[PDB]
Write a protein that binds this ligand. Structure first.
Ligand SMILES: Nc1nc2cc(CCNC(=O)[C@@H]3CCN3C(=O)[C@H]3C[C@@H](c4ccccc4)CCN3)ccc2[nH]1
Length: 318
């Protein structure tokens, strides 16, 4: 009467009343892989209704959603040290024009910087996306490819870095495990963890103090800089006036020695929601001075909390 149910992505169907019964008042049950995924919308119990279509205990006749767990880390680039497996399970390597990075969202999206993927999007060439690996050049990695690249509509390439943000839709769902896990998006009160002098963490394979790209994933803990000091650090030649906007945050040391650098573009500056005990993305590696690690020449990051409406619009509509 209602027919075979639809399959649940990252979940499955199980007939409760009997194997194959699909008639009126027949009961089925949905479920996710609860260890690394969590069911949303409803509790998964659906009863065939007189309308002739499966209906949940809340009246919905659409599937539920198996959302990946996010923000998990085995913890709990200039002047950093080597990450261990599972410290940054969201870290993504993006290979195209040059080496860049991103962060896994859900199991089929990658958050990165617009400047890192702009030339390859408009050249209509797919991005080579790798993850589940600490070594930049290892042959053993989880492979994915870009199905679509969305660059923020206010971004103007080669004309500053306001709105330096982009989303990549992966053509396949990646398997979620302790090795590969997305980063959480910040909640509306997440700014309480991103005040001045609050500590975030940048990770990447970019240039180190040696002046070469790192073979292994690195990371640094660095504090948020007062926005006046951020504006003042880059309000001078050769930078255009207004290079630092309200859509940006600075991070680093007035004495120097800890920074992001070239090759870290698109990586997530993450912060710990100490109450949920989950890591979330507060920044995206965007730009900064030529001399990474130099005193008062802070790294500049795109402010992700400003772009939650844009991210949710794109992920929900595509
Ligand atoms: N202290 C620190 N320096 C950093 C560098 C990076 C490089 C990753 N981003 C890039 O490579 C992008 C694409 C071109 N870029 C620059 O940054 C140049 C361009 C120019 C400018 C014009 C207009 C407004 C502002 C700047 C002048 C010098 N910065 C990452 C983190 C870092 N932390």
């Amino acid at each position: 009467d209602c027919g075979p149910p639809d399959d649940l992505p990252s979940g499955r169907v199980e007939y409760i009343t009997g194997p194959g019964v699909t008639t009126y008042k027949a009961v089925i049950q949905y479920s996710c892989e609860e260890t690394f995924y969590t069911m949303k919308v409803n509790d998964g119990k659906y009863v065939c209704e007189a309308d002739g279509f499966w209906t949940s205990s809340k009246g919905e006749k659409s599937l539920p959603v198996c959302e990946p767990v996010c923000g998990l880390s085995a913890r709990t680039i200039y002047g950093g040290q080597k990450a261990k497996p599972g410290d940054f399970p969201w870290q993504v390597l993006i290979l195209g024009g040059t080496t860049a990075a991103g962060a896994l969202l859900y199991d089929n999206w990658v958050l990165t910087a617009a400047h890192a993927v702009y030339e390859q999007k408009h050249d209509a060439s797919a991005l080579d996306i790798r993850m589940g690996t600490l070594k930049r050049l290892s042959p053993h990695y989880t492979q994915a490819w870009s199905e679509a690249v969305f660059i923020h509509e206010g971004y103007t390439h080669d004309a500053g870095f306001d709105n330096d943000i982009a989303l990549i839709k992966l053509n396949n769902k990646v398997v979620i495990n302790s090795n590969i896990t997305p980063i959480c998006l910040p909640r509306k009160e997440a700014e309480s963890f991103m005040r001045t002098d609050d500590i975030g963490t940048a990770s990447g394979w970019g240039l180190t103090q040696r002046g070469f790209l790192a073979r292994n994933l690195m990371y640094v803990d660095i504090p948020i800089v007062d926005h006046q000091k951020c504006t003042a650090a880059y309000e001078k030649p050769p930078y255009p006036r207004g290079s630092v906007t309200a859509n940006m945050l600075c991070a680093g040391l007035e004495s120097g020695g800890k920074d992001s650098c070239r090759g870290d573009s698109g990586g997530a500056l993450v912060f710990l929601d100490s109450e949920t005990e989950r890591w979330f993305v507060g920044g995206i590696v965007s730009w900064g001075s030529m001399n990474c690690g130099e005193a008062g020449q802070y790294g500049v990051y795109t402010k992700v909390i400003n772009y939650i409406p844009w991210i949710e619009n794109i992920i929900s509509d595509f």
